Ligand binder design. Sequence first.
Ligand SMILES: CC(C)(COP(=O)(O)OP(=O)(O)OC[C@H]1O[C@@H](n2cnc3c(N)ncnc32)[C@H](O)[C@@H]1OP(=O)(O)O)[C@@H](O)C(=O)NCCC(=O)NCCS
Ligand SMILES: CC(C)(COP(=O)(O)OP(=O)(O)OC[C@H]1O[C@@H](n2cnc3c(N)ncnc32)[C@H](O)[C@@H]1OP(=O)(O)O)[C@@H](O)C(=O)NCCC(=O)NCCS
Ligand SMILES: CC(C)(COP(=O)(O)OP(=O)(O)OC[C@H]1O[C@@H](n2cnc3c(N)ncnc32)[C@H](O)[C@@H]1OP(=O)(O)O)[C@@H](O)C(=O)NCCC(=O)NCCS
Ligand SMILES: [Mg+2]
Ligand SMILES: [Mg+2]
Ligand SMILES: [Mg+2]
Ligand SMILES: [Mg+2]
Ligand SMILES: [Mg+2]
Ligand SMILES: [Mg+2]
Ligand code: NA
Ligand code: NA
Ligand code: NA
Lengths: 123, 123, 123
Amino acid sequence: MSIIGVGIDVAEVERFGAALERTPALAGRLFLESELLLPGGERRGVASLAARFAAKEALAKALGAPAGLLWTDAEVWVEAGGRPRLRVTGTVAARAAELGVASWHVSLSHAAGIASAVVIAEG
Amino acid sequence: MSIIGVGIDVAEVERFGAALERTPALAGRLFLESELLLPGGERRGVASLAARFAAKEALAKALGAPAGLLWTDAEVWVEAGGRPRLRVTGTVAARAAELGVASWHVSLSHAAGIASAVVIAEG
Amino acid sequence: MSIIGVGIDVAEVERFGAALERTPALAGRLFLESELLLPGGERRGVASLAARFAAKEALAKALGAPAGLLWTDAEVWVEAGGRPRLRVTGTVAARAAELGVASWHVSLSHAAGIASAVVIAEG
Ligand SMILES: CC(C)(COP(=O)(O)OP(=O)(O)OC[C@H]1O[C@@H](n2cnc3c(N)ncnc32)[C@H](O)[C@@H]1OP(=O)(O)O)[C@@H](O)C(=O)NCCC(=O)NCCS
Ligand SMILES: CC(C)(COP(=O)(O)OP(=O)(O)OC[C@H]1O[C@@H](n2cnc3c(N)ncnc32)[C@H](O)[C@@H]1OP(=O)(O)O)[C@@H](O)C(=O)NCCC(=O)NCCS
Ligand SMILES: CC(C)(COP(=O)(O)OP(=O)(O)OC[C@H]1O[C@@H](n2cnc3c(N)ncnc32)[C@H](O)[C@@H]1OP(=O)(O)O)[C@@H](O)C(=O)NCCC(=O)NCCS
Ligand SMILES: [Mg+2]
Ligand SMILES: [Mg+2]
Ligand SMILES: [Mg+2]
Ligand SMILES: [Mg+2]
Ligand SMILES: [Mg+2]
Ligand SMILES: [Mg+2]
Ligand code: NA
Ligand code: NA
Ligand code: NA
């Protein structure tokens, strides 16, 4: 295998929270039900959601961000140890197949009011 | 192939714009004519230029930033879909050959007053 | 080989400096003697240390951040040309072996009050 694409994205946490609050429908357009909850069942916070949004944008960049990708066709899930993972379906899986992507790698960070993500697509 | 180097760079957009304005000659030392324009023909903005500068610094880091690299020997170009790409020539191509680099991967982001880039060299 | 993990981390420089000053013992828990010095022998500054901390956090993320990793078992060292490198020992080396990691790639940046690092584990 080799690298097919890389993406980076930085989101301003305050700006992202304001966007979610402005339009009630927005959270459900960007996130699956599972992404909106913490492992315990509590509602996921704004910085953590902003990092997940950054991850989806970074994923889109790694694929050359064609038209037709659905936010909900990229899912950030979490291993027991706390590690974030990408699962792709539908439109995002189809674009990944066009490019030959077999494996996804992601990391998230949030500090100083910004949420950051890096995504590497390999295949 | 495998990874030969990775680079990251973050630039403060306001500081970068101030530098360009202070010294008229600076833009032409850092950027090719093509990089200074948008696809339509309009002049590229400061945040976008700062991200391109960050990309060139990240590229230099991926190569171990030896003396003798010219800014103008790294070019950020843009696919129809909007995706940024690196093309290397001259001094930067020669250093890349020393290390066996065959492929370049880049992504750019700008938010909250900062421009960010990640570059991976593979070969 | 292929990619085993990626990590990113962003640290607020001011917050990190305040933490070091608050607890004298903290620097020695996070850093080896060698990391606390510049090539010349002078004491390494706060932004540079914050970037090294970010690197160790990014490394931990690339390995899935299990319990039991020691800060001091990840070392940032510097090539003559100025390039940062990772050397892993003990607990961090053992976790890397569990995952099959043969090679480490790191880059650091600090601007606009934030220190950033990206780490890729390959094997
Ligand atoms: C293009 C997009 C990925 C950019 O991400 P963003 O977080 O909004 O903005 P960022 O500052 O982080 O990134 C912008 C950079 O990404 C890069 N980018 C743009 N198009 C890209 C593509 N086709 N592939 C890879 N990278 C792309 C560019 O380098 C751009 O900077 P530049 O124009 O100065 O060169 C994003 O806006 C998007 O998903 N496009 C559609 C917008 C939209 O309708 N929202 C999503 C729902 S469909
Ligand atoms: C070295 C250079 C790449 C750093 O990038 P920058 O955007 O200016 O500063 P950043 O904060 O983002 O990066 C600094 C970090 O990059 C790393 N860096 C320095 N030298 C490096 C090299 N040889 N290879 C890879 N990374 C290097 C270091 O880890 C450094 O942090 P540290 O000294 O605390 O360990 C950059 O200053 C440069 O191009 N060097 C020459 C300066 C110059 O004259 N300008 C360019 C025209 S020649
Ligand atoms: C988990 C840890 C790596 C996070 O790094 P940080 O710089 O403190 O915080 P960041 O904002 O940069 O990163 C947080 C993100 O990292 C990711 N992360 C958490 N656990 C992870 C793990 N097991 N593997 C990979 N990434 C992980 C998550 O995506 C998290 O965001 P989310 O919970 O919203 O999804 C770090 O706190 C740590 O080393 N854990 C132990 C804390 C500690 O005691 N200090 C270190 C001495 S043992
Ligand atoms: Mg963005
Ligand atoms: Mg953004
Ligand atoms: Mg820099
Ligand atoms: Mg910088
Ligand atoms: Mg962190
Ligand atoms: Mg952090
Ligand atoms: Na499916
Ligand atoms: Na040439
Ligand atoms: Na050892």
